[PDB]
Design goal:
This protein is α+β, with helices and mostly antiparallel strands. The chain has a single domain, classed as Glutaredoxin. About 30% of the residues lie in helices and about 15% in strands. It has three helices and four strands. It has helices at about 15-20, 45-55, 105-115; strands at about 25-35, 65-70, 85-90, 95-100. The chain has a four-stranded mixed β-sheet, with helices on both faces. The radius of gyration is 13 Å and the shape is globular. The chain starts with 13 loop residues before the first helix and ends in a 6-residue tail after the last helix. The PDB classes it as isomerase. The entry lists the keywords thioredoxin fold, isomerase, disulfide bond, endoplasmic reticulum, redox-active center. The assembly is monomeric. The entry is titled "Solution structure of the a' domain of thermophilic fungal protein disulfide (oxidized form, 303K)". The protein: Protein disulfide-isomerase.
Length: about 120
């Protein structure tokens, strides 16, 4: 099946992230998690749900839910806890927005609306 070809699930590698995140034309949300994390294993499935929901909404060309593991190369991302969330707003990018702690997609969407201009006003 698609499993991403539709848009919800998107790949973000060291050689790609720089592009999507730097893209001011559209907003991008790259989340760093791990399978063996234990507390992040849920972040994966939780991202797949919000991805298909937000993707179906009327913001396909406004915000894109991108997932990625925090075990890649050329990725200078120092964080306290694995469940790290990097916010990159379209137009006001250039600064990696590091969250304080994940738990539910509901908190992610809300925040993006407070920090992201595309999901605000």
């Amino acid at each position: 099946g698609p499993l991403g070809s539709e848009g919800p699930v998107t790949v973000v590698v060291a050689k790609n992230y720089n592009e999507i995140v730097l893209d001011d034309t559209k907003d991008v949300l790259i989340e760093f998690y791990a399978p063996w994390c234990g507390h992040c294993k849920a972040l994966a499935p939780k991202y797949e749900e919000l991805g298909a929901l937000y993707a179906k909404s009327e913001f396909k060309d406004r915000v894109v839910i991108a997932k990625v593991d925090a075990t890649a190369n050329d990725v200078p991302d120092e964080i306290q806890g694995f469940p790290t969330i990097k916010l990159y707003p379209a137009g006001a990018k250039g600064q990696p927005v590091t969250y304080s702690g994940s738990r539910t997609v509901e908190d992610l969407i809300k925040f993006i609306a407070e920090n992201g201009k595309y999901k605000a006003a």
